Structures are given as structure tokens and as C-alpha cells.
Amino acid sequence: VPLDGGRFATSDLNDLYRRVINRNNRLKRLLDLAAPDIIVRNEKRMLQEAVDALLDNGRRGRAITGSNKRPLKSLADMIKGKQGRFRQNGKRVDYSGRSVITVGPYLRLHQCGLPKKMALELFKPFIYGKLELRGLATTIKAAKKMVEREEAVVWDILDEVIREHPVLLNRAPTLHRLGIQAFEPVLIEGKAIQLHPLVCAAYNADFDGDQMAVHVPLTLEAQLEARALMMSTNNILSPANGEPIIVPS
Amino acid sequence: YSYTEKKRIRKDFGKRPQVLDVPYLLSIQLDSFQKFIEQDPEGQYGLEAAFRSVFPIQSYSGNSELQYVSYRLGEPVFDVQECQIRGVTYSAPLRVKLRLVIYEREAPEGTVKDIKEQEVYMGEIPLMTDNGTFVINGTERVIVSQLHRSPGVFFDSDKGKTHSSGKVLYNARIIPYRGSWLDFEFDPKDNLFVRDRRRKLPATIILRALNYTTEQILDLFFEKVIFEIRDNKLQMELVPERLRGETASFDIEANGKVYVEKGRRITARHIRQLEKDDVKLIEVPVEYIAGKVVAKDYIDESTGELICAANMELSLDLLAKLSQSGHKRIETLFTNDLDHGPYISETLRVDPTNDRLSALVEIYRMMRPGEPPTREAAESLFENLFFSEDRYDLSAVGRMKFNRSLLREEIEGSGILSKDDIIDVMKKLIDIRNGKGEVDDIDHLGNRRIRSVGEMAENQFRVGLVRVERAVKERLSLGDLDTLMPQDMINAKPISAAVKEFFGSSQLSQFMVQNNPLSEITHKRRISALGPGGLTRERAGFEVRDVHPTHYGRVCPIETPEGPNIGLINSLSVYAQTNEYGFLETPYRKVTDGVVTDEIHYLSAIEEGNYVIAQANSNLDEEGHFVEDLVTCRSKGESSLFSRDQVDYMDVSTQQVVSVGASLIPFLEHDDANRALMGANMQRQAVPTLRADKPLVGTGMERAVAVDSGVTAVAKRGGVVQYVDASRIVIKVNEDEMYPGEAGIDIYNLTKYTRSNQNTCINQMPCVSLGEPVERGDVLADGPSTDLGELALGQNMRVAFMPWNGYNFEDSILVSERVVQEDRFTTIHIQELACVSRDTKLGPEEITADIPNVGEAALSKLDESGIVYIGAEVTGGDILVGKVTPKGETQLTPEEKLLRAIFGEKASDVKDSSLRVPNGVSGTVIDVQVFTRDGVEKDKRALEIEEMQLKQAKKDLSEELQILEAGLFSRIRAVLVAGGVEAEKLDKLPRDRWLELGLTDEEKQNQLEQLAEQYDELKHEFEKKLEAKRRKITQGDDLAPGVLKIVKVYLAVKRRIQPGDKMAGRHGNKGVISKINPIEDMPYDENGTPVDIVLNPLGVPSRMNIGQILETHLGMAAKGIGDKINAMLKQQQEVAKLREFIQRAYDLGADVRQKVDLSTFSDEEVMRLAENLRKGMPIATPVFDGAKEAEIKELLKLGDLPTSGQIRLYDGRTGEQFERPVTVGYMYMLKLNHLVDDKMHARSTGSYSLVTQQPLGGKAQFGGQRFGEMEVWALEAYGAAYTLQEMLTVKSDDVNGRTKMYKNIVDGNHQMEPGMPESFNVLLKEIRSLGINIELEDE
Amino acid sequence: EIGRTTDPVRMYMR
Amino acid sequence: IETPITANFREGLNVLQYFISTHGARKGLADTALKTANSGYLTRRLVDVAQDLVVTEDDCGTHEGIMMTPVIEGGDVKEPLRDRVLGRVTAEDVLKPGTADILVPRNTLLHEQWCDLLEENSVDAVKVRSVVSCDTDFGVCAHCYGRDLARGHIINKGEAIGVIAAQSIGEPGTQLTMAAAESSIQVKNKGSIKLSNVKSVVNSSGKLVITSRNTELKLIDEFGRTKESYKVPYGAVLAKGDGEQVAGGETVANWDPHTMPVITEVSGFVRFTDMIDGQTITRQTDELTGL
Amino acid sequence: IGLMKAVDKFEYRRGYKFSTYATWWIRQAITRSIADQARTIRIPVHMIETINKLNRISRQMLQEMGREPTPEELAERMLMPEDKIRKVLKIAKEPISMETPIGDDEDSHLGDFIEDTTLELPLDSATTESLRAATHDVLAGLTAREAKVLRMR
Ligand SMILES: [Mg+2]
Ligand SMILES: [Zn+2]
């Protein structure tokens, strides 16, 4: 792919494929040219050293990259573990945010604050559905502007989209299953995700700079699960031992 | 008595008098680069000693040398600030003179031909600014020092895990500065073994390689036991002590006397029985020699065959053979089990080789396997490992540590090894095995030296100069030498390749952490242990992450990073200093017989092991006499008590143990060592607020950390202020400080609102007035986070400890709303947005002010040229720089074409790619830069900036004359009082008309002719300066290849405070603001004054930082004398009723060393001292010589406050009184720059990656969050299988299933059709691209 | 003499 | 260190004491960063062996469980029987101290009422069904597993018990990385002495000869149970017999700390078999005092 | 592969030794190949000679003029039209590798920060599916064939 500015940013599988095709194309010239056998033995053993640096690089002299000094990345190094598989054991994810948490002790046990600046960007495509069903905007491009100017009506439609829609708060080093719980949001103003006090002892969170990612369950079978299975009032006893986990801290 | 002292005197507690003043806080950097770039007329360290290390380059067997003459550093083209603008380094060309001489073919070796090539330019070397920070690409970088192992020998043990059966293996090692290592060792069989890290050899082969026969190898190590056969029984010699610790095995007899029997010990008087009785030649049996080993090799003088060679047994047959063979003087080796073990003789048994040539091949076929050896190829290899002056250099310091560890006489020597050095390391190793020696530790700070910038920048330079010497060695041998000067062979690209790639990319050449006058100062005193040639963040275990007993006064123990490399960063101490060689030293007071002197002796880390050092807090009765019989010292690493007539040294001050950043915490000895390690790292993060003031509770180490940095503009010569202004100061120096001929005045330019590295703003404000006399070392311009010279990092606000309705539940904080009205935590931030204009292949982009189909409201602030006005308030989404990129080949769908013909709209022939302000950031536009590649015509706007900035470079060049000639002519005209009566005729003529007249031939006209040279000199030089200054403005700029013109815009957004922000005091008490209460909810005492912040008290018992509870009482105390001078000075009572109170607030101690008041002016000083004190009398409390708790109570009775420290607050809303009184004080609160405006994020859909199609962010909508493999076991622990099937199929990866989920959501139908992700189909093509076949059985 | 050498430079030089 | 820091935080610490107290702090921060990277690798191997275990049946029919008794550590019991069997099916029917008195029926979830009813009586041991011995193929029955959950009912068919058991073992560990004479066996209680599985009888002087390491002490309570467990070393002196009550803290069987001497089982001659001088032990001198 | 050609074309009746003859064919082929098959984005062999001729001359301007040359001044040292020298300058640079660890050497590479542009926003894909709805309607208000020509033309 060409980087912006005139310079290209290739992979490093194009150096190991361009070296198998040279030493293999020269080995055809050397055989139709009838070279002495002392040379076409240095080409067979030199060809199959380039093919064995392609598949798994490192079980030999570790053919260092060109134009640099670090070893290239063979095919068996993309599959080979980074502590995780190439596929899903990692999945960065859409419809998400993150911000600082604060106290907000006025809440119930099943809700959480959520700024009006994240509720309007997490729930954007849900808003374009109301602004055309309710009949305010005409097309979906004309509605994309009303969510930019923040007219007085989009706050009326954003407050209605967030009616019974639970969101999944989750802290950074999720140790046990109580690191991901759901909460019914309530729009506050500011830029910090509030959080009930009884719940922070389960996340193991102090309020001195700790950030908390917030996801969004889209489908209809994924909101009846963030309400019956992963809600915050369904998790009052820890699963390690039956003793409670909502202890006033 | 400095004028910055008597404007606000800081009431100083502290009892121990100070004998040594704090040094210059940047001698680490500023000293070690003056050694690099400096003309040094000797072979000392420097750049000069990197030429002699290569030159002269004698030709390759052709006899034509290239010799080195001298070098020279030109002056840089661009200045510093002009280098931070054009975006290029600030360096100086390196001129070098070489003389190439041609020696004769076969005639006498004379100078047949020679040519001295004038200054072959061989690369530029960057220069250090006045503050120790380089300017590499317009961005100030810092080069932290290092802490690596010194070069020498370090005998080590490696006990415990050695073979899992005990029997430790004392291994030696040699480490040079540059070269191959060499590492002896023992093994579980007691057999020495040599080995850089290759396969190990039997150790005796490197002895044979040095041409030592097997005779001498038993000659050097072991002791002979002489043996003769005087016609009967083989009478054996004997030395008395050699019988030590042996099990007797016969009838010990001599002199007729049978001393002992067989099967017993040996006693002391048994050796005594031989000493006094002199038992020399004793007769013993011949069967006891049935296990000995011969010393030397015997042949038969009759036959001519060697019967016994070195390291051979002695049996009855050989006992039989050598008797009649004509031999009596037998020779054997004494080998004890404990004292003299047989460690070499065994290693001569597994020795496969036999001599030198048979030995060298054995190491060669280990060092280069596969290839066949040769006698000419094996010898040259081993001869170049440790014995070549150019492939092995121990050091100048290595040879010191080498000899110092073998107890050798001299200290200096050659750089390469020898035969005495490779052997003495083998004796000293085997002696450690027997028991008379001890191993070394590698964490000991006498084994680890510091490499500053001048010792890394040079080793990186000589590597760039050795790559050149290999090329000039070639060209001198190929061609003929009647034409090539010493300028066609020198290459500049290789030499400047190494010394530029180190300064611009490394583990050490890192950006300057610049958001304080304390984050800079403590980034140049950094002592890192990583980098090229050191540890690694992952391998390094807790052996070196610890705090030795040797760090006392050298390295701070309570200031390291807290992340994954704790104990590898080690901010250097306050008084510590580097040696000649590189080891850290500390200053101590020489203690004579009984009395403590004032002489200071900088002690190393191994000289400190012998002496007995006392403690800094030990009393002295005015004559250096310890007032105690015995004191508390430390001798070998442990403290204890010693007699008063035994100490040898005493420490300088109480704060010589702590860093420069941990010495600003007051009450440090009342905090946990954990909490004060987190409090020293949350103080170099604080942001310089809008108008910073001061700390009411300091440590007196603030005037040194704000002056010894670079932010303040300190006077350079005494004088009198003449013209203060917002952007300039003009000091008119005194006469005695002024130079004799044409000196004039000093003129300091300030640096108004500019940009730091973290995008904070950094500008200076003047703190002087007109007429105020400024003295040498004063302070004229405050910086960012400075005030009157001191270092203020934040504000100090009325804090009250109590739990308030759960808005400060956890560490969170609760801030009132009079702290947001007064606008005291508001900071300024200055970003830079750049709008480049590339040259595509469809045509060149343009900066048109007319953008295709954009509403007129968006084009309101753009002028006709396209670029925004300078002063406009922009917000999110606005256009700052209009730009259009060409685009043809429309090719629109069928419906889009029918939609055209119905409305006939013209096609768009250009795509709009303007620069737009980022989302949610809004503030004025305070500048604009416009660069233009040389060859394109400037637009109307870029040609206006080029004529508005040209008017200032000429105005500033003229105002340098007209205001300085205000001091030049006004001097000599005031000097022209003599030499002719010219007072009214002194101005009846024009002052310019003085080339005709003058003054008599004395000091009157001495300047009149001195100005005569300064007449034409300040005439054409200002003229010659102009025409070269108007070329750097009008000439083009060199942009990248492919760019046309660049436009940089600077927005200055002022970020206020809000919930989510992060605040923190000094003592490690972080927090996050959780609310901004109205003014009337906050608690109020009886007077009605609400508190300004409400902390939580449950953070003090658990984390033991009790500093913040005493700083809160000495806060309220210092502000009690605030509202006492603010009332007396408000009724304007009298300067006598005021002068006496202030004098009573300064003594106030228990044997304090204030030496203060009543020497002060009548009413000009006391009415200005009492005016700066009305906010509150600033206290100062040194680190460990604190203000005891009984002296804080003496202040609270001065301000008429409650001595206990606790007031009775009332509630804010209910109006009722809090039971059980509360604390209210004054905590100096910082404001960390973990602003919540940069943490918040949100994303619904954006830009997806390239190979795997998952989200990432470069288009103002960054990537989604990370759904790790830990957050997927939390969704399988539940039964959430429908949340997990979409969280990794439709929301992230599935290409044609995540667009259907976007039309089903706008269509009001929440349902998904998942499919299969793309991250898996990129795994079937990579497992297939091996031989492996893998598919999907469909059923 | 065939000393387990891998790199094809030494195997070609000798 | 031999000299202790004798100063609080309400009074200061001098330079020489605040430096000594730093290693105790720098060492704590170097383990709290290592106990996480070392614990986040134990809870990743656990959740890859127990990855595929899932409750997939309601009952299998196996009677094989494990015996659940309170673990008693020497002089004190560590975990009562209520903490160990609470929420677990009963592999077979338990009965009172009088037999044929089946109080808990066939396999029933021992919730609160059946757990207090076991403490109301004096039941000593139950045999509950564990998942290590269930009979199902590819999974475990819901009865073998048990009850305990965030909820309180029995385990629902379909749950994923393999992953929620690898995390509860790996949630800790991130935080917890780490006169005594005892010559006389001191019992804190007053219970009968009842030994079992021992081959040893009283000698002449009134001392049961120690024969091996198979002799433990069971302090049978007043209800036909145990409360204490001990052992018997060489040179074990004794006071009581079996069934003879003892007051709290009476030395019944004792051994010296620095004397674990060779008890004499039977009296008689000593003859030299592999213990003559030189052979296995050298010959040393003394008079008849026996030193 | 070149030296085999030297011995092929060698002719000793000139009287010149072999090393002075095969050293040309050998040094020739070792450089003819570096020009053709050592760059990722292959540039020809006639253009390679111009870049080499532009560094041999961009060095003399360095060690003589001192500071450095400029692409205006290389027009006179060389003899080119001053617009081709601005095309030869940006041809030389070779591509980065997409595994180079970014600044500070974080746990992330440069291959995670290059987005892809073949894709298209799901709001433009939600618009062109909304244009089929209108034109299926707005055309549906027309007659039997007066809409037929519109779908056909
Ligand atoms: Mg935290
Ligand atoms: Zn079962």
C-alpha cells in the first residue's frame, strides 16, 4: 500500500518471495547454460535455504531483513502465537467508547451515568431510524446533519432511544466474570462515566484515574441477555463462594 | 540581602547549619559535552582523541601516509529559534585539515611529495543549547546518561543452582571497553575451563597458545617438593608448615626424635618442634610416594629415553626405574586438599593438545567450525583476539580496575592484554577457590560507571570515522597519487550517518518531558540503565532492581518509575557527581582529631568502605566537638555507635540522600516510602496553570530548581532597569561592572506565548518595574510555573477532611464553585495543525479559497487567499485552510445519472479535502506559517506574511541601535565633560558631527576613537546583518520531495476544570473531581467562609501519608499570619505597629538560623514586604530537618487559632453543626495533565484495517475498544452466546454482514445475519501457503 | 572436518 | 536487621532509618508488578484445559462420591463440615448416631435447612457426589456438580462450568503471593483419647513402645466424633491409655525438641551386629556413667 | 555466471593475461544484477546510471561548497533541464517494512495504522439503497411506457 507522501509501505513477505523467484530463476539459467557442477550445487543449496526462510525463519542463520537490521517475518511467524491466535483468541470492536469514572452516589443499583457526548456517538444509527420514522428528516443524509448541529429535537430522540437499552461496562484487566456487567444508562452532562458505589468493589476500581470501556448490545437477543443474565442486580453473590459481593465497602 | 530576598522573606525552620551550597543542577550534561567539542592540546578524552585513534592512515604496503593536523568547528547557519521553526537540526560543520604525503618507491624514506588539503568537511555534529538540550528536528531532545558495568575483572560465584549439589563454581571474567570477552570457570569436577560465549575448552589450552611448555605450566602454579636418594630410603626434604592439616601416615622422625606416629593430626608445637629444632632433611618410607606426581620431565642420561613427563604418577616400577637411571634430585608437586588443591594438574590431563601449533587449531576449530585450519590462518586469528591494539581496547578506566583488583602496583598501562594478565587472572581465581579471597557483587555502585553524552556521542562518532578509514586505505593502494588530493577520498555521508542516527533515534535520545521547570531539570539528571549495552526491561530480575547500601548520597531511593521498569531509572541525587573515570562521588566534611572542619572531600564508592562516616544530624557545640560521648556512624555498610574520637567524616546536609524532585516534598520523613515514591512522580506531571503563585509550605529548594533551569530570565550584570515592557527588558549596567571600551547596556528579550512539547503554553512575564535596581544573579522574567523566582506548580486552597454525602467516596475529590469562578486551575493549550499541498499524478492540489459545494457559512472566516484570519474563533468542524484535490473519471451509477438529467447539475471536477478543526476543540487562531517550495508563485496571503515579518527584522535591527545608542552616545557625551569645555556647544552641533572635534588624548577621547572604530562597525555590520537577514526571509524553503506548500495553524484553547479531571497533592494522594458544588452548599465555619475542597479522611489511616495532615496545620498557621497582616495593613495603622509584629513572626523557633529582621528599610521595604505577605507568610521546612510538631503549635497561638488544629464547621444546606470538630487547612494542590478532554472516546463506525478488516483509527474516529481474550471468558461464564456471536462477527470483522446490520438498525429491525469473519479466511490462506492443506467439510 | 556448519558461505568457501 | 526502626510516623524518621525502610518498599512494588504477569499465565493455562467442560445432563446415576469431613490441623479444626458440604447432593442416605434413623433422605441438595439439621445432630461425615467421578460422556451431570452459584438453585443444564472454575482459582493469586516447644501434646479441650491403626502396647514403666510412624492421636468428643489429630515420634513418652479422659492441656504423649531418643522396647543385652568399631561406628571411650 | 562467459570468449593470442580480461566480465555482471534485481519497485538500468551520476556529483558540491547543493544548482553542475532532476529525486527511495515498531517501541507495529480505502462508508451504502426506493416510486407515478423509456434510455 502507498503511504501518504510518495513512499510505499510494503509487507516483509515481498522480500522472501522476491528471493525465492530470483534464486529459482537463476537456477534455470544455470542448468540450460551447462555450468560446472561445483556451481549448480551452490545454487541448489542456496535456493532451498531461501525457501526454508520463507516458511519458518529462524531455524537457520536467521536471514536478516534488507535495508534494516531486524529479522524478517516468515509465514510461520504470523500464525505462531503472540500469546493469542491470529483469528479471535483479538477482535477490536465497533460501537464502543471509554472515559474516566467518578462517583455519582445518587444512582440506583441498576443504572450508570453516560455523557451526552458518548450517548450521541455510540447510538448514532439508532437515531437515524427515529428521525425518519418520526418524520422529522426526509432522507438519511438530511438526518446526518441534524445529529451534527445537535438541534433541540435530537436530544428528544436520543433520550427516547436510551429508554430500556442496557450497555455493557467493562474494566481493563477483567479477572473474573463480574468485570463485565450491564447497566441501564441515564444521560448526564460532562465527560466521565459515573458508577454506583456498591458496584466498584466487584470491578476492583478506585476513582483516581481508572478508565472503563462501555460497549453496546445491538440485536434483540443481545439486550434480553444484558438484562436477564448480565444485569447488575442479578449479580449479588460471587461464584467463587456463595457469599455476597455487594458489601457496603 | 538580594532584592529577590527582601521582597518576600521565606520563614525558614531548620536547625542544622548548612556548610555546602547546592551545586549547579545540570553539571551532568553541560560538563560532559564541553569535553567532546573542545580544542584539547593533549591526548585526553575528547573529539581530538578520536582522530589520533585512527590517523595517521599509513598506506596499504604502498608507503603513502595521510596525516591529521587539527580540526575546527564552524558556526551554525541557523540560530536556535529559527531552527525550531524551519524544522531542522542546529549543528555546526566540522572542518579538518589533513596532509597527504607521498613516500618514495625504493629511495630513502623521505617526504617526496605532500599536500595539505584545506579543511575536508567531514560531517556536522549537533550542538548543545545553553540548557543541556539538543535541537534535532526543531524539537528539543535530551540524552539521558547510562549506568553500565565498568570494564575489568569481576570474580563471581553462582552458588546454589550450580549442579543442584552445592560445590559452588567460582568463575572469573574479563570485560573490556571494546573487544572479545574471555571467561574462565570451574565445573563440578574441579577442572578449570576457558570459553565470548562459544563451546567451552579445557582451560589449559590458552596457556599453551601463549607458548608455554608443559614444564612451565607446572612451574608457575605449583610448589616443588624436592626429592633425593642419598643411597637409602629416599630421604625427603621438608619445610615445617607444609605438614599443615595432613593425616600422618608413618613414624615422623628426625634428629633421632620420633615426633608423631602414623594416623594422627599435626599440632602447632609439632611445627614448632621443627622450627626451633630445625628438622630439614627427614627419612621416610618409599611407599608413601606411591601417589605423587613428578614435577619436571626426566630422561635417562645413559639410554636417552624420557621415563617420566610432567603430571605423571610415581609407582614402585618408576621408583625402580629412576634409581639406577642416574637420578637422585626428584621433583614433585605439593597438593593439599584444602590449601593447595590440584586444580591445574587435573586440567593438564583432559588437555588433548600437546603444543602451540596443536593448540591454536583446537581453539580455531571451536571459533570457526567447518572451515579447515591453517598454520598461517590459525595463528593470525588468536593473535588478533586479545592482543591487537585496534581490535581490543581494555580502557583507560579498565586498566585501572584491572590492576586494582589484582593488587598490582601501578594504575596505568597498555590497552591490550598480555601473558602476565591472562595468567594473573588465573592465579587470583584459584586462590578464591582455596579460600584466601572473596567474590565481587555486580550491584555495587563501585562496579558501575556512568556514560554521559560526551562518552556516547564520541564512540558513535569514531565508528563513523572507522568506516571511512577503511575506504581511504583502499584508494591509496589502487590508483596513482599525483592527482588525488586529501579531498576526493573523504566521504561525508558515512561519518555524518552514525553521529546523526544516534542523536535522532535511540533508547536514550528521547523527547524532553517539558511541562514544568521541574520536569526538565529531573530529565537531565536521569541515570538510566537500559540502552545499547545494558539490561533489558524483561530479562532483568530483582538482582539489580534493588536498592544497595551504596546508593547513600549517589542515587535516590524514592524516585523511580512505578511501571514495569522500577529500579532501572534511578534519578540521580542532589550532591552526587561523576569522577574522572565515571564513578559517582559524594561530599563529606573532613573530621580531624576531635573537631569537625569545613573542608570538603568528595569520596568515591570504594574509598567510602574504609572510613567511618558520621551522620548529618549530630550536634556540634560551635567548635565542631560532638556533644556526645559516642555517636551514630556507618563503617562497612551497617550503622552502629562509635566513640567520639573514632569518626573520620561527616555528611554535608540532611538532604544529600534524596533526589532533586523528592526534596520539594515538605514533611518527607512522615510518609511511607511507597507513598512518597508516588508523590515524587505526580509532581513532574503538574501543568503550569494560568497565574501560578507559590507554596505556603515549601522546603527552601525552590529558588534553586527554578533558577538553575532555563525558564527564568536572570540578570547577567548588575545595574538599573530602564524600560520594562511585556516583551522586553533593558538593564543599564553599573560602571564598575561595565567593560572599559564601548560596552553600553544589556537587553533581555522574553518569549511570549509559544508552544511546548506537550502543547502547553510557555511564556515569560516581567517581574521588575522602572527604577528597580537589579543585581547580578537576580530574576527579571518569571517563566511558566514560577513566581518571584520560586517554583510554584499549583494553587493552595482551603481543604477540609470529612466524608461529605459520598461525593468523595473513594479517592475522588469534591471541589467548590468559587474555585471555578476565580479561574485558578485554568490552563492554556496550543496545538498545531498542518495542511500540506501534495503533487498528485492527476495534477497539483491547490489552496483555493473557493471549495466545491460548501455553504457560505463555512467560508465566512477564510479570506480570499484561502487561509483563516489571525484572530478568528474557530470551533469543531470549521474550515481553517481551503484545499481542493483534482478528481476525474466520475463513473456514477444509473440512478445517480437519472437524478442528474432531472436537475442538470454540472459534474464536480475536483474533490474537497480542506483542513478542518478537530472535533470538540475550539479557540482562537494565534498564528499561521506558510512555507513555499522554491519555484512556485506565492499566493496573496503568503506574500503578506513575508512583508509583515520583514518589517520587524528591520525594526528590531534599528531599535537595537536607537535604544542602545541611547546608552552609547549618552555615555561618552557624559564622558566628554573633560577634553574641552563642551556643554552647550556639546549640543549646539549634531552629535553625529564629531569626526571633526573630540577630546584631549586621554580616557576622554580613548572612547571617542574607540567609538570611531565602533562608528563604522555598528554602521556596516548592522547593514551587513540586514541584507543577510532579508535573505532568510525572502529565500525559499526546502520542503520534502513532492510537496508544494505547507500551512501551519495554531489554536489556543483554554481548558477549564470539570468532573473527571485528575488532581493531586504532593504526598501521593491522587483523586478525581466528582462534583462542583455551588458556593452555598460547601461547609462554612463561624465567619461564613466556605471551604474550597473537601477531601476524604479514610485515605490517611490506610496509606500512611501523615505528611498531608501536618502540612494542613502548618498551612492554616501560615495563613493565620496572613489575615493578621491583612488587617493591620488595612486600617493603615502605622509602620511601627506593623514592623514589630512581622519581627515577632520571624524568630518563633527553637534555636533556628533565620538571621532576619530590623536591618530592613524604614518604610520602603517593610511596606513592600508586608504587602506581599498578606496572602500568608510563606514557611519553609527542609526535608529531614523539619518543623517539629511543637513549633507548629507556637504559630497557631500567634494567629489566635485553635491549637488543636480542628475547627467546628457548620453544614451548608441544613444549617446545623457537624459534631466532633473537623480539620481545615491549606494543601498545595497540583493539577496533573490527565485531562478528561483527551481520554473520552466514542465510535459507531469508521475506518477499518487493511489486511484484517477490523477497526483502527487515523481519521478523527479512532479504533474501537479491545475485546481481549480475557473479556471473552467473561461472556462465556454467563450464557451470553448471542452477545458473543455478534461482538466478534457483526460488530468487528464480517465484511458483508456488518453493513446489513447498519441498514436493519436504521430500518427499525434489530436482527443480524452473521456469516463468517474475515480474520479466519486470512488464516486459511496462510496455513495453505505452507504445504499444509486445510478445508471445510461441507455437510 | 565436517563440523556441523550450517551457513552456506563457509560450506562454499572450503 | 538487628536494630529496629523505633520511630513512628507521628514523629519523624532520621536519614539513616528512612533509608533502611526503603528496601521494604522497593521490594513490594517489584513483586506486585510480577505477581500479576505471573498470575495472568496461570489463569490462562487453567482456562484452556477446563475450556470445554459443560453441564450437559440432569442425572447420571452413579453412587460414587467422596467422603467430606472437616479438615483438622493438629490442635485446631480449620474448616467446619458446614462450609464443605453446603450445597451438594448426598451420594447416599446418612443417619443419626443411632442407625436406621435416616434423617437426610436419598440424594438431596443440602441447603441451609439440611445443613443446620446436621449441626443440630452430631453427624461426623457425609459422602457427597463430586464431579471427578460422574459417569456422563463429554460433560458432567447437574446433580454431580452441585448448587453454588451467583444464584442458589441447582445448576442449570447448559451452563459453562469449565470457565467459571478457572477464573475463581485465578482471581486470587494476583494479590496473595505468600516459643513453639510442642514437646507435650497440648489439647485445648477435654475429650477421650481413642487411638486407631496402631501396633504398640504399654511397656513395664507404663509406656506404649513406639514402633513406626503410624500412630496418630484422635481426641474423640462427647458425641462420637473427633476434634484433634496428632502424631507419635520416636522416644514418645506417654501418660494415659485409650478411653481415659484428659483435662485441657495435659501432656499425654511427649517428645523432647532436642531429644528424640531411641526408646527401649524390650530390655536385655546389646550385641554388636554391624556396630563394632570401625565397621559402621568408631569405638570411643568413657566410664560406666554412660556418656 | 559472468566468469563462465569470460572463459567462453577468451582469446590468448592477444597476449594479455586472463585476470585483466575476466575481471571486466565479472565486475560487469555483479553490477548489472545489482541494478536489475535488488530493488522492490524495479527501476531500469538506464535510470540507475543517472542516480549514481547524481550522487557522484552531489558529493563534489558538498565537500567544495561546504554546506550542500540545491536542486537549482545541480542543474548547472549536471546538464539536465532542471525538471527531470526533480523527477529523479523522488524515484530512489525504497519502501518501508510494515513491521517496523513505532516510536517508543510500543507493543504495536506500523501495520495497524494504515487504513484501507477500497471500502465505502455504510452511510453511502445506506443511501444508494434508498435511491432505488425513490426512483422505483417517482418513476412509478409515470405512465406505462413513459416510465419504460426512462428505465430503457
Ligand atoms: Mg486506580
Ligand atoms: Zn452425574
Automatic annotation (TrEMBL), chain C:
<comment type="function">
    <text>Sigma factors are initiation factors that promote the attachment of RNA polymerase to specific initiation sites and are then released. This sigma factor is the primary sigma factor during exponential growth.</text>
</comment>
<comment type="similarity">
    <text>Belongs to the sigma-70 factor family. RpoD/SigA subfamily.</text>
</comment>
<protein>
    <recommendedName>
        <fullName>RNA polymerase sigma factor RpoD</fullName>
    </recommendedName>
</protein>
<comment type="subunit">
    <text>Interacts transiently with the RNA polymerase catalytic core.</text>
</comment>
